[PDB]
Write a protein that binds this ligand. Structure first.
Ligand code: SF4
Ligand code: NI
Ligand SMILES: [Zn+2]
Length: 729
């Protein structure tokens, strides 16, 4: 019933088909499928038809195939009928329909060829090294979903071929990274950007895939979105294409001299709804309106692609000397690249947002008080105290901690600006490159001002930013800040699931996970780990129409498992009626659903009488016989999964942590690093439960084993309480 092809209806008037383009696509699709045919036959000769084949760290087999036709490719023989089908759908008649089918066959061919390449890939002997990615694992797709759902990443650019010259490559890519687009790069443009010292790699959301058929690692990335968050069944071809067209705002930049295989791959992009913009001149018989178009002027090609795709960018439009955007949030500034640092146990530091009255503030006044960063030798240090005063008619003291959180992100988005921690434990660094470009502390203050005004227009009327660098002045002001921090800690201490009468929904991820609803209570953070009850409450109070809504706690059904009719009704209504009940204190019956951005996954193991937990960053097998990525393929997508649940890491430290299932006492296995990340809260909560602070050492981890038979003897020897608790079944 989904007629996806309707989006093409007006594109080409009959009898004027661009036969030059369609012949090139046909030749390239024949070439790609032939490449795959011969490599596959040779591989079956060498290894045998039953040899396993696949990609590293994915739940979705060969994802392009798994999405569009649903096959669970596991061995070489499985790909033989699939490729035979794709070659069969490549047809000489020069229609737009046959061109799109040839592009789909080209994507299938490139995916097959790449899986064959990975037949030689092992961790000890890998076929790709950073900053190149090749196939991108599921955890990376998931780790960036939270930035996609609110269009912090506004769209995706697939750049194929070669820019006119190195300098043009750096120009457009710097532009795109400042706009926050996710980049996929293929062929000679990568070396062009590295030659120009552009930052690239998974940490900068700018993926150097490789060359040639590695282009398909853009496609199998994009299609996993619908398979993961969208919950769309494998093989629902038009449903997947519709999800891509509506939610994955990707386009292709086709740079350099054209070639048949690159053109056929680009037509596969068009086949799933992504337009193609090339820097090459195009004769009338080699173009399609709004789908395969020429913009030779490098000063316009980015805006042209964004307009044809429908991407609208919000910019602060302050003249900063450095680039700014999500790609730089993940950067590290090594000591040898550091021009100056503040805080981090080297010098005193704090940051503070505070409400003030109308008379108390000069809107827009950004002032540095003390020496600036040109006063130190490179590698030097200064104190820093950042005070952001805010006035507004709708400003509340409650909002102060919320706004203060943003300083971290606001700072880290600066290229060559870096920030970690919070309050009086901040550590800030500024790169030598940023200093060389003219960055000074005034620019940090201006960035904070503009960003606070842009993000909170309805509660911020005046903003003033003062940055202090005198050591004794910073130490004096830090005590005022610490008074505010203690008031905030006391307000937090007053909260509990029982003491508040209203929990809050979070629908932010419904952009990509339409049936999923999060419920945030004081003692259960949202599964992303970034939205606590105070956060959701402030977000609603700032924007009553937004994706966080109050829900009264009314109509109790089960005090023990945590079920109320008010939450049941809200979830059912906002679930497209897929979900009727939710228990807040158990994973074993009506668990809360997940999108796919969960920091960790819990699962029950009957053989161990207890829970395993595994975080997204952990690589390795778990005692349930599944890696994190496989478990995540089951747990996400907005379906209810008794015995499994997605969670935020900090929820493990909550007093209400799966309380009806036994809480922390029920946890028998976690990765060693995750326990270390949470060691203090695990020790404190275990003491509160009566488990002992050494309970953390009774929790098995991968150094104990990855299977039940390795783990159970250790649990028995340790006298883990879970073995003597009631089975949860
Ligand atoms: S609280 Fe839930 S719905 Fe909201 S952003 Fe986090 S994971 Fe997504
Ligand atoms: Ni999610
Ligand atoms: Zn999500």
């Amino acid at each position: 019933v989904i007629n996806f092809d309707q989006i093409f209806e007006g594109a080409i008037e009959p009898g004027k088909e661009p036969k030059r383009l369609f012949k090139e696509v046909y030749e390239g699709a024949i070439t790609a499928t032939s490449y795959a045919e011969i490599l596959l036959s040779r591989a079956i000769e060498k290894y045998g038809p039953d040899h396993p084949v696949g990609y590293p760290d994915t739940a979705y087999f060969l994802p392009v195939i798994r999405a569009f036709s649903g096959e669970e490719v596991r061995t070489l023989k499985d790909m033989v009928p699939i490729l035979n089908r794709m070659r069969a759908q490549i047809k000489s008649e020069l229609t737009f329909e046959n061109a799109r089918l040839a592009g789909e066959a080209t994507w299938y061919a490139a995916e097959i060829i790449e899986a064959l390449r990975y037949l030689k890939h092992t961790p000890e002997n890998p076929i790709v090294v950073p900053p190149w990615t090749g196939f991108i694992g599921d955890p990376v797709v998931r780790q960036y979903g939270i930035k996609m759902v609110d269009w912090t990443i506004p769209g995706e650019a697939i750049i194929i071929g070669r820019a006119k010259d190195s300098k043009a490559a750096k120009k457009i890519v710097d532009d795109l990274m400042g706009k926050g687009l996710m980049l996929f790069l293929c062929d000679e443009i990568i070396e062009q950007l590295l030659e120009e010292n552009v930052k690239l790699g998974v940490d900068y959301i700018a993926y150097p895939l490789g060359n040639f058929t590695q282009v398909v690692h853009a496609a199998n990335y994009a299609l996993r979105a619908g398979l993961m968050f969208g919950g769309i069944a494998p093989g629902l071809r038009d449903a997947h294409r519709d999800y891509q067209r509506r939610r994955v705002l990707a386009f292709v930049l086709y740079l350099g001299e054209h070639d048949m295989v690159k053109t056929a791959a680009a037509m596969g992009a068009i086949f799933t709804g992504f337009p193609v913009i090339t820097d090459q001149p195009l004769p009338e018989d080699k173009q399609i309106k709004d789908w395969f178009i020429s913009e030779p002027d490098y000063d316009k090609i980015v805006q042209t692609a964004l307009e044809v795709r429908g991407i609208k960018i919000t910019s602060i439009d302050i003249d900063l000397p450095i680039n700014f955007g999500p790609a730089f949030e993940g950067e590290s500034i090594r000591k040898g690249d550091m021009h100056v640092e503040f805080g981090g146990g080297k010098t005193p530091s704090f940051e503070l947002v505070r409400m003030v009255g109308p008379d108390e503030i000069e809107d827009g006044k950004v002032e540095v008080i003390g020496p600036d960063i040109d006063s130190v030798e490179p590698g030097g240090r200064l104190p820093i105290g950042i005070v952001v005063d805010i006035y507004g008619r709708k400003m509340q003291e409650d909002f102060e901690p919320v706004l203060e959180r943003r300083i971290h992100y606001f700072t880290n988005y600066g290229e060559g600006f870096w920030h970690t921690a919070q309050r009086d434990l901040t550590w800030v660094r500024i790169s030598k490159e940023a200093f060389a470009k003219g960055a000074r502390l005034k620019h940090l203050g201006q960035l904070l001002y503009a960003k606070f005004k842009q993000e909170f227009p309805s509660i911020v009327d005046r903003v003033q930013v003062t940055i202090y660098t005198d050591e004794q002045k910073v130490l004096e002001l830090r005590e005022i800040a610490r008074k505010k921090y203690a008031e905030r800690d006391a307000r937090l201490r007053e909260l509990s699931d029982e003491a508040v009468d209203t929990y809050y929904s979070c629908l932010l991820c419904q952009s990509f996970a339409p049936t999923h609803v999060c419920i945030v209570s004081p003692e259960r953070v949202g599964l992303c780990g970034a939205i606590s009850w105070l956060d959701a409450k402030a977000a609603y109070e700032i924007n009553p129409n937004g994706p966080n809504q109050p829900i009264p706690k009314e109509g109790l059904i089960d005090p023990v498992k945590g079920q109320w009719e008010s939450f049941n009704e809200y979830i059912y209504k906002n679930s497209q009626r897929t979900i009727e009940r939710m228990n807040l204190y158990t994973i074993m019956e009506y668990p809360m659903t997940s999108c796919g951005c969960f920091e960790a996954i819990m699962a029950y193991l009957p053989e161990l009488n207890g829970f395993m937990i595994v975080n997204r960053e952990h690589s390795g097998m778990t005692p349930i016989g599944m890696t994190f990525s496989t478990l995540a393929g089951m747990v996400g997508g907005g379906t209810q999964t008794p015995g499994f649940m997605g969670i935020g890491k900090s929820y493990i430290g909550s007093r209400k942590f799966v309380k009806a299932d036994g809480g922390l006492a029920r946890v028998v296995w976690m990765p060693k690093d995750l326990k270390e990340q949470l060691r203090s809260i695990i020790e404190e909560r275990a003491e509160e439960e009566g488990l002992g602070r050494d309970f953390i050492d009774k929790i098995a981890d991968e150094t104990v084993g990855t299977t039940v038979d390795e783990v159970l003897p250790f649990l028995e020897e340790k006298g883990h309480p879970a073995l003597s608790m009631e089975p949860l079944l």
